[model samples]
Target: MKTIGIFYATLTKTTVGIVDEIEFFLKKDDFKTFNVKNGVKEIENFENLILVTPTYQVGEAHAAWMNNLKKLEEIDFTGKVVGLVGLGNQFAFGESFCGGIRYLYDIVVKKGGKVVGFTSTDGYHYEETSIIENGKFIGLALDEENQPNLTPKRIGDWITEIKKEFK
Candidate 1:
């Protein structure tokens, strides 16, 4: 079995809900998931890493997560698969909704990690907007009560893709 790590930085618990759902789906496949907070030590012994973060001001990811990126820089992922997911309010900040995912995508790539998939909030439903190399988009989700435009299924599909890539 391949080990998987899920690290998230959230402020209002919106991203927490998304991360929890994704963790549930991954666990169904027997993948280990961790809901790590900021300032935690670097993760190890994982075959893949999935990062989820909420977008904040403009095109910036939440400051908390941004700070954690520095820790990732010192780590190694030569053979590890990587993925990203972003959560945000599309009604108010459409352009920055996926900013957090994009930021992590670039960081992972720069650190020599192979990106497998990425998911973004589309107001009400999660969407798999990008495919890394030969990777596949797994699934998505939706939170109709809060952000009617926010979807989370894309994140599920992403995890499925990661499982396939590393399995």
Candidate 2:
């Protein structure tokens, strides 16, 4: 019965779809997922917080997501496990798309939160890749036909790992 907060700042609905799929998968595991768009009243009660967004120009996240990050700064995440998910055209930007997630990771760490993991989608291409502590890369999906195939499973597995790690 761990409470997990999932917030997404999406422009074209692609990231929203990914977050929804993640929510669905986590629900199956009996974890509570909250989509914090406008804001959340009490994030301090949650055991974990996940921020999902789509990459914009170069490595930056969408402007809306940046604004959400500013809002998140006003809260406290002490002792909370934090994770990030960024969706982008990998063939186009590669590691540049990770800029947003990287920024979020820095902020979370500075605020005394522990980073559990990170994930990225290969939307324009066909790869699903994730990064864990110590910079380990895990390929969950591969090339073209695999596009959009890893959201559910990857998110589910990620959530499971995070819960297990922190518990």
Candidate 3:
């Protein structure tokens, strides 16, 4: 059985590219991908999970996430290992950059998910963000807007770190 399940939501489809890069670098077939529009139930199929989403509005997740919030709240994340990947436009929303993933982080932790993949806040120039706690993001934070050039390296490094804990 696949050990990892990656679920994501997109607005203008920038998130599709992020997920593509993650799958490419992971170089493994022990995973599956699903659009959260299909609902969060598919996550029950795996003990390891990666959630990718982009911040929209002010510190908010994409529409699909709001749509599924009720169902998401109903699910149990006990003992599951979850890694988060979020995209934001640092230049435009520096204060709330990548804050969308905060919702996922809260729900997962509150419901018992063992979230992993905390990444460094280095190289990012955001003024403030909820995704950052104690000088590190809760998970992988990507800015395909201002620093698209750095995304490849960030995703690669994040995958390497998370893969160990994923198992």
Candidate 4:
């Protein structure tokens, strides 16, 4: 079995809920998790990665994300698969909605990580989001305040999708 690591940054506690659900369903006996708020600065020894976070103002990543973000460069994800989950408000931060995840996606790709689970914008109403590329989100974007009802299904479906992609 391949090793997997889930690292998440929490803000407003929405990201906390998302990560809990992810851990509940995705965790394997060998899986590991890093809660960035609790001093998780570096991630190692994983063949696959799942990055989760909540966006800050104007598309910026939460402070915790910055604490550990740059260190990802030291890890070679050449053959690794990565997944992203982000929380943002469409009504309040549409122009930069879920933009934090975009930053993470960019870095992962820069270091050769194969990101999976790009999602549709069908149910979301946002003027723009940097996370979107080619009409799909760089990864799963969730609006916990506005569209909380959709999160569970989105997370479930995304988990299923990435499983296939990783295989």
Candidate 5:
């Protein structure tokens, strides 16, 4: 019952590297990683999900996710609790910070997924981002390129918050 599936796509390996830390914080059996290129149907096996991606081309979906876009849209996330972790450089791409998560968020909501893990925007400095809702980012927004030092604590705190809702 504790199993959570992680569907992810990586470009510079940063996203996948973060996935490693995510795995460390949880029990080995509590989660599984599924590359988006492999398929999206694997998500149906778990009620809790973590969708990870690195923003590319301002707001474009990752290459793997773009290739699997149709498959992603067809899935039904009804009764599923979903979380998000998006990588972006707030310093270089502040105007579109973590916009990639916006793409996934819209799709998940359209498919009836209950998205959680919304985080505050206090420490960030972004001009604009599609993922912002009610003045808060849709989920964890990380900037490893500019602020790698903050990532570990951010991930740990984010996991603690989402872990409760995942149940």
Candidate 6:
């Protein structure tokens, strides 16, 4: 079985919903999953990672992706496929929204991981979000507080996008 490691950390417990739903999207007879944390010390056993977290404390890495990320540099992320999902409150901190995803994306990229599942920002209405890279979000960025209605379809659509590159 090809196992993918899923790591998540939430702010208002809403991001957990996104993570859980993402797990559901990854189901397959040949697929496998291992729930984990963002600050894990060992990643040599993992070649695929899906990080679902939220931007918290005004745009920092949040409680989960804190300074502990040094653990990842110990392992090479070359030839790895990593995906990201972020949950942010568009009304509260729209300027620095979803920075956590950007934070992790930078680290993973710096570590040589190839990213997939970047989504379009059509339905979203936000002043700014660091998650926007070259016009598309690094992965899934859902504003469950403001645009809850769009969540389901966004997740479903992104699942298809990632399926094309989940290897």
Best by lDDT: 3
What lDDT score goes with residue 55 in model 1? Answer: 70
In model 6, where do residues sit more than 4 Å from their true spots? 29-38
Task: Give the per-residue lDDT of model 3 (tens digit) for 33-149.
Answer: 899988888887788999999998898889898778778878789978999999998889869988988999999988899989998887788877788766789988888878899
Q: Show the lowest summed lDDT stretch of 10 residues, model 6.
A: 29-38
* lDDT (C-alpha, whole model) for all candidates: 0.59, 0.60, 0.87, 0.81, 0.85, 0.73
Off by over 4 Å in 4: 27-29, 38-42
Q: Clashing residue pairs, candidate 2? A: none
Tens digits of lDDT, candidate 6, 1-167:
24677777765678778867777777661343433343565456667777777777777656757655666556678988888888887778868767778777888899888999888878777787767888888888878888888888888888777666766
Listed in order, each prediction's TM-score against the native is 0.74, 0.73, 0.95, 0.91, 0.94, 0.87
> Would you list the rank order by TM-score, best first?
3, 5, 4, 6, 1, 2
Better of 1 and 6 by TM-score: 6
Candidate 2 lDDT over 1-167, as tens digits, reads 46677766767677767767777767655444555555555566677777766767766667766666776676666878876776666565544534556656666777788877543433433233223345442212222223557556666787677666453
- Where's the lowest-lDDT run of ten residues in candidate 4? 38-47
Q: Rank the candidates by lDDT, best first.
A: 3, 5, 4, 6, 2, 1
Of the candidates numbered 5 and 6, which has the greater TM-score value? Answer: 5
TM-score of 4: 0.91
Better of 4 and 6 by TM-score: 4
Backbone clashes for every candidate come to: 20, 0, 0, 0, 0, 0
Clashes of 4: 0
Angstrom error at residue 160, model 6:
1.7
Q: RMSD in angstroms, candidate 1?
A: 4.7
Clashing pairs in 3: none
